[PDB]
Amino acid sequence: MSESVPFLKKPEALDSSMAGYAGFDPLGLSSIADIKFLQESEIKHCRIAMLAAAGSIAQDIFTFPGVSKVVGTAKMTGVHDVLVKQGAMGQILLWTSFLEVFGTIALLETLDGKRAPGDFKFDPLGFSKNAETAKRYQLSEIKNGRLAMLATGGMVHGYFITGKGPLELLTN
Protein backbone atom coordinates (compact mmCIF):
# COMPACT_ATOMS: atom_id res chain seq x y z
CA MET A 1 0.00 0.00 0.00
CA SER A 2 1.03 3.65 -0.35
CA GLU A 3 1.82 5.97 2.54
CA SER A 4 -0.02 8.84 0.83
CA VAL A 5 -3.02 6.89 -0.52
CA PRO A 6 -3.81 3.86 1.68
CA PHE A 7 -6.25 2.14 -0.71
CA LEU A 8 -3.93 2.03 -3.73
CA LYS A 9 -0.82 -0.14 -4.03
CA LYS A 10 2.63 1.33 -3.50
CA PRO A 11 4.17 2.69 -6.74
CA GLU A 12 6.81 0.22 -7.87
CA ALA A 13 9.25 2.63 -9.54
CA LEU A 14 9.29 5.12 -6.65
CA ASP A 15 11.58 4.41 -3.69
CA SER A 16 11.96 5.84 -0.19
CA SER A 17 15.58 6.89 -0.76
CA MET A 18 14.62 9.60 -3.26
CA ALA A 19 13.95 13.00 -1.71
CA GLY A 20 10.37 14.17 -1.35
CA TYR A 21 8.97 10.64 -1.38
CA ALA A 22 5.37 10.37 -0.20
CA GLY A 23 4.57 7.23 -2.21
CA PHE A 24 2.17 9.32 -4.30
CA ASP A 25 1.58 8.22 -7.89
CA PRO A 26 -2.02 6.96 -8.28
CA LEU A 27 -1.97 6.93 -12.08
CA GLY A 28 1.43 5.21 -12.16
CA LEU A 29 3.06 7.76 -14.48
CA SER A 30 6.43 6.79 -13.00
CA SER A 31 6.18 3.35 -14.64
CA ILE A 32 5.55 4.87 -18.10
CA ALA A 33 8.57 7.20 -18.09
CA ASP A 34 12.08 6.87 -16.69
CA ILE A 35 12.10 7.93 -13.04
CA LYS A 36 15.40 9.82 -13.36
CA PHE A 37 13.87 12.02 -16.09
CA LEU A 38 10.81 12.67 -13.93
CA GLN A 39 13.00 13.62 -10.95
CA GLU A 40 15.04 16.05 -13.05
CA SER A 41 11.88 17.59 -14.52
CA GLU A 42 10.19 17.92 -11.13
CA ILE A 43 13.22 19.72 -9.67
CA LYS A 44 13.47 22.03 -12.71
CA HIS A 45 9.74 22.83 -12.56
CA CYS A 46 10.10 23.53 -8.83
CA ARG A 47 12.98 25.98 -9.24
CA ILE A 48 11.43 27.91 -12.15
CA ALA A 49 8.17 28.11 -10.22
CA MET A 50 9.95 29.25 -7.05
CA LEU A 51 11.54 32.12 -8.91
CA ALA A 52 8.18 32.87 -10.55
CA ALA A 53 6.21 33.05 -7.29
CA ALA A 54 8.80 35.24 -5.56
CA GLY A 55 8.95 37.48 -8.62
CA SER A 56 5.17 37.74 -8.71
CA ILE A 57 5.09 39.05 -5.15
CA ALA A 58 8.20 41.23 -5.69
CA GLN A 59 6.82 43.06 -8.73
CA ASP A 60 3.88 44.17 -6.59
CA ILE A 61 6.13 45.33 -3.75
CA PHE A 62 8.76 47.15 -5.81
CA THR A 63 9.77 47.83 -9.39
CA PHE A 64 13.25 48.55 -10.76
CA PRO A 65 14.20 52.13 -11.75
CA GLY A 66 12.66 53.28 -14.98
CA VAL A 67 10.58 50.14 -15.54
CA SER A 68 7.34 51.98 -14.67
CA LYS A 69 7.31 54.01 -17.88
CA VAL A 70 7.52 50.88 -20.04
CA VAL A 71 4.94 48.92 -18.02
CA GLY A 72 2.01 51.30 -17.66
CA THR A 73 -0.35 49.22 -15.53
CA ALA A 74 -0.09 45.59 -16.65
CA LYS A 75 1.07 43.07 -14.02
CA MET A 76 2.02 39.34 -14.06
CA THR A 77 1.37 37.94 -17.59
CA GLY A 78 0.52 41.45 -18.93
CA VAL A 79 4.05 42.85 -18.28
CA HIS A 80 5.52 40.04 -20.46
CA ASP A 81 3.65 41.34 -23.57
CA VAL A 82 5.18 44.84 -23.23
CA LEU A 83 8.63 43.58 -22.37
CA VAL A 84 8.35 41.15 -25.30
CA LYS A 85 7.92 44.20 -27.55
CA GLN A 86 10.87 45.83 -25.78
CA GLY A 87 14.02 43.72 -25.52
CA ALA A 88 13.72 42.32 -21.97
CA MET A 89 11.96 38.98 -22.57
CA GLY A 90 14.11 38.08 -25.60
CA GLN A 91 17.38 38.77 -23.73
CA ILE A 92 16.20 36.58 -20.79
CA LEU A 93 15.16 33.82 -23.23
CA LEU A 94 18.58 33.99 -24.90
CA TRP A 95 20.59 33.62 -21.72
CA THR A 96 18.30 30.94 -20.25
CA SER A 97 18.51 29.02 -23.54
CA PHE A 98 22.29 29.17 -23.37
CA LEU A 99 22.11 27.74 -19.84
CA GLU A 100 19.67 25.04 -20.99
CA VAL A 101 22.01 23.84 -23.75
CA PHE A 102 24.44 22.76 -21.04
CA GLY A 103 21.41 21.54 -19.11
CA THR A 104 20.64 19.26 -22.08
CA ILE A 105 24.10 17.71 -21.74
CA ALA A 106 23.48 17.34 -17.99
CA LEU A 107 20.09 15.69 -18.64
CA LEU A 108 21.75 13.14 -20.90
CA GLU A 109 24.21 12.29 -18.15
CA THR A 110 21.38 11.88 -15.63
CA LEU A 111 19.43 9.59 -17.98
CA ASP A 112 22.48 7.39 -18.49
CA GLY A 113 22.62 7.07 -14.69
CA LYS A 114 26.16 8.42 -14.25
CA ARG A 115 25.07 11.70 -12.59
CA ALA A 116 22.51 12.26 -9.82
CA PRO A 117 19.48 14.21 -11.11
CA GLY A 118 19.07 17.90 -10.41
CA ASP A 119 22.64 18.48 -9.21
CA PHE A 120 24.73 21.07 -11.02
CA LYS A 121 27.30 21.22 -8.16
CA PHE A 122 26.29 24.86 -7.66
CA ASP A 123 26.98 25.73 -4.02
CA PRO A 124 28.77 29.11 -4.07
CA LEU A 125 28.25 29.54 -0.34
CA GLY A 126 28.57 26.29 1.55
CA PHE A 127 25.24 25.19 3.01
CA SER A 128 25.37 21.42 2.44
CA LYS A 129 28.62 19.94 3.75
CA ASN A 130 27.14 18.36 6.88
CA ALA A 131 25.55 15.40 4.93
CA GLU A 132 22.67 15.41 7.47
CA THR A 133 21.66 19.00 6.87
CA ALA A 134 21.95 18.34 3.11
CA LYS A 135 19.05 15.84 3.06
CA ARG A 136 16.83 18.17 5.13
CA TYR A 137 17.65 21.03 2.75
CA GLN A 138 16.80 18.78 -0.20
CA LEU A 139 13.41 17.90 1.27
CA SER A 140 12.84 21.60 1.95
CA GLU A 141 13.66 22.39 -1.67
CA ILE A 142 11.19 19.80 -2.98
CA LYS A 143 8.34 20.90 -0.70
CA ASN A 144 8.94 24.64 -1.27
CA GLY A 145 9.12 24.08 -5.02
CA ARG A 146 5.89 22.06 -5.06
CA LEU A 147 4.18 24.82 -3.10
CA ALA A 148 5.56 27.40 -5.52
CA MET A 149 4.28 25.46 -8.55
CA LEU A 150 0.81 25.41 -7.02
CA ALA A 151 1.19 29.05 -5.94
CA THR A 152 2.31 30.28 -9.36
CA GLY A 153 -0.74 28.73 -10.97
CA GLY A 154 -2.95 30.13 -8.24
CA MET A 155 -1.72 33.72 -8.55
CA VAL A 156 -1.72 33.81 -12.36
CA HIS A 157 -5.29 32.56 -12.46
CA GLY A 158 -6.31 35.29 -9.99
CA TYR A 159 -4.67 37.81 -12.36
CA PHE A 160 -6.70 36.36 -15.23
CA ILE A 161 -9.97 36.85 -13.38
CA THR A 162 -9.40 40.35 -12.03
CA GLY A 163 -6.00 41.72 -13.04
CA LYS A 164 -5.19 42.57 -9.43
CA GLY A 165 -1.90 40.74 -8.95
CA PRO A 166 -1.05 38.74 -5.82
CA LEU A 167 -0.66 41.35 -3.05
CA GLU A 168 -3.23 43.86 -4.34
CA LEU A 169 -5.94 41.19 -4.53
CA LEU A 170 -5.32 40.32 -0.89
CA THR A 171 -5.78 43.97 0.10
CA ASN A 172 -8.86 44.28 -2.20
Binding site: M1, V5, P6, F7, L8, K9, L27
Partner: protein
Protein backbone atom coordinates in the same frame (compact mmCIF):
# COMPACT_ATOMS: atom_id res chain seq x y z
CA UNK B 1 -33.03 -15.80 0.84
CA UNK B 2 -35.49 -12.84 0.79
CA UNK B 3 -37.79 -14.65 -1.66
CA UNK B 4 -37.93 -18.46 -1.28
CA UNK B 5 -39.75 -18.56 -4.62
CA UNK B 6 -36.64 -17.34 -6.49
CA UNK B 7 -33.34 -18.82 -5.21
CA UNK B 8 -30.22 -16.86 -4.38
CA UNK B 9 -27.43 -17.16 -6.99
CA UNK B 10 -24.46 -19.27 -5.94
CA UNK B 11 -22.04 -16.69 -7.41
CA UNK B 12 -23.13 -14.23 -4.72
CA UNK B 13 -20.98 -15.07 -1.68
CA UNK B 14 -22.84 -15.50 1.58
CA UNK B 15 -19.89 -14.04 3.54
CA UNK B 16 -19.79 -10.62 1.76
CA UNK B 17 -21.42 -7.76 3.73
CA UNK B 18 -24.96 -6.62 3.05
CA UNK B 19 -26.06 -9.97 1.61
CA UNK B 20 -29.77 -10.69 2.01
CA UNK B 21 -29.78 -13.08 -0.95
CA UNK B 22 -32.29 -10.95 -2.87
CA UNK B 23 -31.27 -11.56 -6.47
CA UNK B 24 -34.46 -13.00 -8.02
CA UNK B 25 -33.38 -12.28 -11.59
CA UNK B 26 -29.85 -13.59 -10.88
CA UNK B 27 -28.08 -10.54 -12.32
CA UNK B 28 -24.95 -11.40 -10.30
CA UNK B 29 -24.01 -14.16 -12.76
CA UNK B 30 -23.86 -11.74 -15.71
CA UNK B 31 -21.33 -9.33 -14.18
CA UNK B 32 -18.28 -9.50 -11.92
CA UNK B 33 -19.37 -9.60 -8.26
CA UNK B 34 -16.58 -7.28 -6.98
CA UNK B 35 -17.41 -4.63 -9.59
CA UNK B 36 -21.12 -5.00 -8.81
CA UNK B 37 -20.43 -4.45 -5.10
CA UNK B 38 -18.33 -1.35 -5.80
CA UNK B 39 -21.00 0.07 -8.11
CA UNK B 40 -23.60 -0.46 -5.38
CA UNK B 41 -21.54 1.24 -2.64
CA UNK B 42 -20.66 4.21 -4.91
CA UNK B 43 -24.35 4.54 -5.99
CA UNK B 44 -25.49 4.52 -2.31
CA UNK B 45 -23.07 7.34 -1.31
CA UNK B 46 -23.99 9.62 -4.29
CA UNK B 47 -27.74 8.97 -3.69
CA UNK B 48 -27.42 9.73 0.06
CA UNK B 49 -25.89 13.18 -0.71
CA UNK B 50 -28.62 13.88 -3.31
CA UNK B 51 -31.58 13.13 -0.99
CA UNK B 52 -30.36 15.14 1.99
CA UNK B 53 -29.55 17.93 -0.44
CA UNK B 54 -33.21 17.94 -1.48
CA UNK B 55 -34.42 18.31 2.12
CA UNK B 56 -31.73 20.81 3.17
CA UNK B 57 -32.25 23.00 0.10
CA UNK B 58 -35.80 23.79 1.18
CA UNK B 59 -34.96 24.37 4.84
CA UNK B 60 -31.72 26.40 4.46
CA UNK B 61 -30.12 28.37 1.65
CA UNK B 62 -26.61 29.78 1.58
CA UNK B 63 -26.51 33.61 1.48
CA UNK B 64 -27.12 35.24 -1.88
CA UNK B 65 -28.18 32.10 -3.77
CA UNK B 66 -31.76 33.44 -3.65
CA UNK B 67 -31.05 35.91 -6.46
CA UNK B 68 -29.33 33.34 -8.70
CA UNK B 69 -31.87 30.53 -8.07
CA UNK B 70 -35.65 30.36 -7.98
CA UNK B 71 -37.12 30.39 -4.47
CA UNK B 72 -38.25 26.73 -4.58
CA UNK B 73 -36.52 24.35 -7.00
CA UNK B 74 -34.68 21.01 -7.17
CA UNK B 75 -33.38 20.03 -10.65
CA UNK B 76 -34.52 23.47 -11.68
CA UNK B 77 -31.66 24.75 -9.52
CA UNK B 78 -29.15 22.87 -11.70
CA UNK B 79 -30.73 24.28 -14.85
CA UNK B 80 -30.82 27.82 -13.37
CA UNK B 81 -27.15 27.73 -12.29
CA UNK B 82 -26.17 26.38 -15.69
CA UNK B 83 -28.21 29.08 -17.43
CA UNK B 84 -26.22 31.78 -15.69
CA UNK B 85 -22.90 29.97 -16.29
CA UNK B 86 -23.67 29.74 -20.02
CA UNK B 87 -24.75 33.38 -19.86
CA UNK B 88 -21.24 34.22 -18.65
CA UNK B 89 -21.85 35.17 -15.02
CA UNK B 90 -18.72 34.64 -12.94
CA UNK B 91 -20.67 33.92 -9.75
CA UNK B 92 -22.72 30.97 -11.02
CA UNK B 93 -19.89 28.55 -11.77
CA UNK B 94 -20.85 26.06 -9.05
CA UNK B 95 -21.58 23.20 -11.46
CA UNK B 96 -18.11 23.25 -13.02
CA UNK B 97 -16.41 23.14 -9.61
CA UNK B 98 -18.53 20.22 -8.37
CA UNK B 99 -17.98 18.38 -11.66
CA UNK B 100 -14.24 19.07 -11.65
CA UNK B 101 -13.58 17.95 -8.08
CA UNK B 102 -15.75 14.83 -8.26
CA UNK B 103 -14.13 13.94 -11.59
CA UNK B 104 -10.63 14.44 -10.14
CA UNK B 105 -11.45 12.19 -7.19
CA UNK B 106 -12.86 9.55 -9.55
CA UNK B 107 -9.75 9.76 -11.75
CA UNK B 108 -7.36 9.24 -8.84
CA UNK B 109 -9.45 6.45 -7.30
CA UNK B 110 -9.65 4.74 -10.71
CA UNK B 111 -6.94 2.08 -10.12
CA UNK B 112 -8.68 0.87 -6.93
CA UNK B 113 -11.57 -0.90 -8.69
CA UNK B 114 -9.27 -2.67 -11.16
CA UNK B 115 -6.76 -3.57 -8.43
CA UNK B 116 -9.47 -5.23 -6.32
CA UNK B 117 -10.66 -7.11 -9.40
CA UNK B 118 -7.12 -8.54 -9.65
CA UNK B 119 -7.33 -9.77 -6.04
CA UNK B 120 -5.65 -6.75 -4.46
CA UNK B 121 -5.44 -6.46 -0.67
CA UNK B 122 -8.05 -3.71 -0.32
CA UNK B 123 -11.59 -5.06 -0.25
CA UNK B 124 -14.36 -3.39 -2.30
CA UNK B 125 -15.55 -0.10 -0.85
CA UNK B 126 -12.86 0.61 1.78
CA UNK B 127 -10.84 3.71 0.98
CA UNK B 128 -9.74 3.85 4.66
CA UNK B 129 -11.33 7.31 5.10
CA UNK B 130 -12.10 7.37 8.82
CA UNK B 131 -10.34 10.47 10.24
CA UNK B 132 -12.42 10.63 13.41
CA UNK B 133 -11.98 6.90 13.93
CA UNK B 134 -15.10 6.69 16.10
CA UNK B 135 -17.48 5.03 13.60
CA UNK B 136 -15.18 2.26 12.23
CA UNK B 137 -12.60 2.08 15.07
CA UNK B 138 -11.64 -1.34 16.55
CA UNK B 139 -14.45 -3.98 16.42
CA UNK B 140 -17.05 -1.42 15.09
CA UNK B 141 -20.88 -1.87 15.27
CA UNK B 142 -23.65 -2.64 12.73
CA UNK B 143 -22.76 0.67 10.97
CA UNK B 144 -21.11 -1.35 8.13
CA UNK B 145 -24.56 -2.72 7.06
CA UNK B 146 -26.27 0.51 8.30
CA UNK B 147 -24.56 2.44 5.43
CA UNK B 148 -25.90 -0.17 2.95
CA UNK B 149 -29.48 -0.07 4.30
CA UNK B 150 -29.61 3.74 4.49
CA UNK B 151 -27.98 3.94 1.04
CA UNK B 152 -30.55 1.67 -0.58
CA UNK B 153 -33.29 3.72 1.06
CA UNK B 154 -31.58 6.83 -0.27
CA UNK B 155 -31.52 5.45 -3.82
CA UNK B 156 -35.27 4.83 -4.01
CA UNK B 157 -35.87 7.96 -1.88
CA UNK B 158 -34.00 10.14 -4.39
CA UNK B 159 -36.06 8.55 -7.13
CA UNK B 160 -39.23 9.53 -5.32
CA UNK B 161 -38.08 13.06 -4.51
CA UNK B 162 -36.90 13.75 -8.07
CA UNK B 163 -40.01 12.22 -9.66
CA UNK B 164 -42.18 14.45 -7.49
CA UNK B 165 -41.60 18.14 -8.61
CA UNK B 166 -41.50 16.82 -12.19
CA UNK B 167 -45.30 16.62 -12.30
CA UNK B 168 -45.72 19.30 -9.61
CA UNK B 169 -44.23 22.57 -8.48
CA UNK B 170 -43.82 21.32 -4.90
CA UNK B 171 -40.47 20.66 -3.22
CA UNK B 172 -39.58 17.86 -0.76
CA UNK B 173 -40.50 19.56 2.52
CA UNK B 174 -43.52 21.20 0.87
CA UNK B 175 -44.80 17.96 -0.65
CA UNK B 176 -44.36 16.08 2.64
CA UNK B 177 -46.11 18.91 4.51
CA UNK B 178 -49.20 19.06 2.29
CA UNK B 179 -50.36 16.10 0.19
CA UNK B 180 -53.05 16.62 -2.54
Amino acid sequence: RAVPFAPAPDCLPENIPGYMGFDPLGLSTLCNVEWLREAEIKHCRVAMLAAAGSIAQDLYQFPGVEKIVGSAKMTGVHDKILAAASTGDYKAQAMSQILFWTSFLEIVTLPAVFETMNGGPRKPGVFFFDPLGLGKGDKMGEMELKEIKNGRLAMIGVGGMVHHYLLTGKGPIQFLSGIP
